[PDB]
């Protein structure tokens, strides 16, 4: 039971040391890519990268280099492609991943400007008439609908492929309520939401992995898929209280470094699968 492992923390407000646990088992792979001089743009944080092993290789002979890496959960049956906001320049190389992997959704969970400054670029077109072409990747991108709600939009936009003239609609699915401190006061809003991306079938093995992403792609981001593949595996189990989140956690930063940037994110992650396994269960 996590529910009363999390109400043991709680009690004990051990938080902190619990989280600090996690980080200092939590393992350690070579970025030499990443850290290539002349990816230097192409990376949004000094401190956040994607380690070799699991990074996604852009097809192109040129500089198949992005900052995302993709995570594979092999019991879960769950895959997810974590990167950071795009940056000026990495629109292009962002969509040509899209692209590339196959994927049918991509789960924004920050907003452009946050906190006064930017933490990601406006990757997309705001208005119908107004479409975007990457010449670099020579990728043509078209709002085809936006549907607002209280905490979340959700677009639909047509990715084509200039170079073949081959199109196919991709799923934006931007949580717009994540505050620019600390985490959500309740889950609540945060697990509809991912609720919303599963309907989708963006999350389903017949589509490339879905693309997810924040600032760093690695606190909000790892909320969210950490979330998701502990409620996955609580459905399959014979014994869905056998699920550990702190395991869980530590196989996923297998695939990148950081996930879950504090012990406010680790305890909302506990919340989250606690709250979202009482819905989905009974
Ligand atoms: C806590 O550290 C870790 O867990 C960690 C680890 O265990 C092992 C390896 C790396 C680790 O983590 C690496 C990052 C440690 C803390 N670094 C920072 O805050 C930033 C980059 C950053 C920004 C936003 C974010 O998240 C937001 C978002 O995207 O909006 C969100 O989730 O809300 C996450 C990371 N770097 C920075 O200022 O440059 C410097 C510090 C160089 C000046």
């Given at each position: 039971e996590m529910e009363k492992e999390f109400e043991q923390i709680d009690k004990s407000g051990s938080w902190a040391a619990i989280y600090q646990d996690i980080r200092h088992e939590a393992s350690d792979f070579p970025c030499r890519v990443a850290k290539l001089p002349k990816n230097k743009?192409?990376?949004?944080?000094?401190?956040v990268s994607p380690f070799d092993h699991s990074r996604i290789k852009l097809h192109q002979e040129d500089n198949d280099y992005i900052n995302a890496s993709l995570i594979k959960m092999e019991e879960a049956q769950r895959s997810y492609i974590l990167t950071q906001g795009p940056l000026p320049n990495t629109c292009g190389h962002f969509w040509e991943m899209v692209w590339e992997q196959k994927s049918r959704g991509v789960v924004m969970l920050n907003r452009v400007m946050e906190k006064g400054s930017?933490?990601?670029?406006?990757?997309?077109?705001?208005?119908?008439?107004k479409e975007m072409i990457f010449e670099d990747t020579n990728l043509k991108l078209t709002l085809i609908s936006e549907d607002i709600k209280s905490y979340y939009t959700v677009r639909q936009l047509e990715l084509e492929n200039?170079?073949?003239?081959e199109t196919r609609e991709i799923l934006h699915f931007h949580?717009?309520?994540?505050?620019?401190?600390?985490?959500?006061?309740?889950p609540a809003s945060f697990l509809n939401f991912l609720f919303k991306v599963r309907e989708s079938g963006?999350?389903?093995?017949?589509?490339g992995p879905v693309v997810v992403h924040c600032s760093?792609?690695?606190?909000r981001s790892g909320t969210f898929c950490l979330a998701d593949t502990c409620l996955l595996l609580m459905d399959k189990?014979?014994?869905?209280?056998?699920?550990?989140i702190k395991k869980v956690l530590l196989e996923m930063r297998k695939f990148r470094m950081?996930?879950?940037?504090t012990a406010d994110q680790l305890r909302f992650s506990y919340l989250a699968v606690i709250e979202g396994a009482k819905f989905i269960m009974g």
């Open positions: 743009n192409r990376n949004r944080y000094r401190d930017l933490k990601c670029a406006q990757y997309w077109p705001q208005k119908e008439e200039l170079t073949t003239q949580y717009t309520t994540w505050p620019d401190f600390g985490v959500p006061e309740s963006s999350l389903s093995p017949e589509h760093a792609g690695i606190g189990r014979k014994d869905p209280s056998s699920v550990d950081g996930l879950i940037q």
